Design a binder for this molecule. Structure first.
Ligand SMILES: *[C@@H]1O[C@H](CO)[C@@H](O)[C@H](O)[C@H]1NC(C)=O
Ligand SMILES: *[C@@H]1O[C@H](CO)[C@@H](O)[C@H](O)[C@H]1NC(C)=O
Ligand SMILES: *[C@@H]1O[C@H](CO)[C@@H](O)[C@H](O)[C@H]1NC(C)=O
Lengths: 221, 221, 221
């Protein structure tokens, strides 16, 4: 019958209280002869009926795609609860199940450092801001830029990369224009990792004197 | 017959991911003729079975006390979903039902400040550290002190007090010995309020009353 | 069967000469059949005819209530003179005598330390100062605020909180226009308590009480 996948929740959703995390069981390549799609979610051997069933979606190759969204709770996912998606279908001869949980590795606290642009790139119209996040295990991590408490969109982030000690490390290149950088604006890097206390951290990068790299102080003594 | 209370979960438990939030409903004044009690837990009317009942405690007034604890979800409680501990017992002509939820309102974020001890304080055996938490809403915060990631215990916190502009504020004195203070220990105060980003903030305090304020700024370049 | 309540004066009144401490005796449950009441007092067994009685009041319970007020010189209350409230009511099988005097406990002098506001608040248009009080027994104390001999009213005080050593401690944040604090206006926190010398003390504040005078500045490069 139709293939059934599994989607883990975004680690940013799982590590943030304000965000709702979801465990997703998607079905792909479903024919029109079998529109009946059923799910049975078992958490640690306990069936849960709280799942929400999204509408089916038709692709260009005339296949349905029914999305099974289950609202997961952060304490559950972080503590090691197994989530079983038992789907019984007409086109499937037998029920299909897939097991998903969290990575049961040894947590390692990320170290976050922010680096100002070097003077080489101070000639262009847009400077690059670097957020080094090294020494964290595992790769379930997310990073974004915030300026004066509001989100920043013009940035990218390299995927985590294996290191010498077996941990991971990744970067985040924030492209702001030269003027806003040169006004002394405060840019902050936000990193959410399971090993971090409160699953959050922040580093600030001022223009001249907050981080001493170029020095000119009107000291108030 | 018996009577039923309702304990909201601690704000420290609710606003911290690693902690376990729970709604405790307490039944006291239970006679010997009806010692067995049934707990039906509802979250917006939906029954749950994950509540862990507790052994009876025989009170000195010739009665019992049986308590059932439901571990709530952080998203569920902090959103404002209702919680009803329905207690069924033979003695009660009508089973007791009470409902508790998060205090609805406009959550104004706190503005944490920290105040180093006055100069007159450093002439005593122990100093006191002030962590002002002003202008928040509502009055559900637990404040704890930390030192280099270690917990602090010798501190007290004033109950939240009203503020002229309708908000709240509160205080916390950290009693530490003067010697550790005078070395240059990095003491920090930890707040957890629902209106913050990640519902957590930490304010640093060190020997200097700010960088350009105290005895000398030994510039090293 | 009337009941004779008795209430001490507010401690703020008793500690300070200008305000008037008073003996507030209440006769409650005064039936309408025998509503006429006679008031008597003893000062260590001596009748005094210098008191005044507030007029009769009506309540929602179809009963009567009266309150009488006797002027007390602060010395008599301070050294524990005995005040007894006698009521000669016609609905009484016997006169009721209630004895009130100074609530004698051990005294410990409050140690008033005032703390300047932190620079983090200095960005706001309002600034909150602090007058910590600690190590005093018992918890009956009034803290006021003044500047240039003129009292301020934009202040709030937290209720006393028990300390580790059995004493108490409390705080008093007062908010001012930032500019008013910026020219180094003085701000004295008055503390009135029995254990203090003269039942009164004060500690001042100034833009330069957090900014010292010694500056051993060093430039090592
Ligand atoms: C340093 O900053 C001061 C701020 O008053 C400014 O006037 C001065 O030109 C600056 N000097 C530099 C950038 O060399
Ligand atoms: C000034 O700073 C230096 C840094 O080397 C320190 O040794 C010295 O004690 C400071 N001065 C005072 C008066 O504390
Ligand atoms: C002031 O700083 C100088 C330079 O470091 C040092 O030699 C001197 O002892 C300091 N004065 C003090 C600590 O009183």
């Amino acid at each position: 019958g139709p293939s059934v996948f599994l989607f883990p929740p975004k680690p940013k959703d799982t590590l943030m209280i304000s965000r709702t995390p979801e465990v997703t069981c998607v079905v792909v390549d479903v024919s029109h002869e079998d529109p009946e799609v059923k799910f049975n979610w078992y958490v640690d051997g306990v069936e849960v009926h709280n799942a929400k069933t999204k509408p089916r979606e038709e692709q260009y190759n005339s296949t349905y795609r029914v999305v099974s969204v289950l609202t997961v709770c952060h304490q559950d996912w972080l503590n090691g609860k197994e989530y079983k998606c038992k789907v019984s279908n007409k086109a499937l001869p037998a029920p299909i199940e897939k097991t998903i949980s969290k990575a049961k590795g040894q947590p390692r606290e990320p170290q976050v450092y922010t680096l100002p642009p070097s003077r080489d790139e101070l000639t262009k119209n847009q400077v690059s801001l670097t957020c080094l996040v090294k020494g964290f295990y595992p790769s379930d991590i997310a990073v974004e830029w915030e300026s004066n408490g509001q989100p920043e969109n013009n940035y990218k982030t390299t995927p985590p990369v294996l290191d010498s000690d077996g941990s991971f490390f990744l970067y985040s290149k924030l492209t702001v224009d030269k003027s806003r950088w040169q006004q002394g604006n405060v840019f902050s890097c936000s990193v959410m990792h399971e090993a971090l206390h409160n699953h959050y951290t922040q580093k600030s990068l001022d223009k001249s004197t907050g981080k001493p790299t170029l020095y000119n102080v009107s000291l108030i003594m």
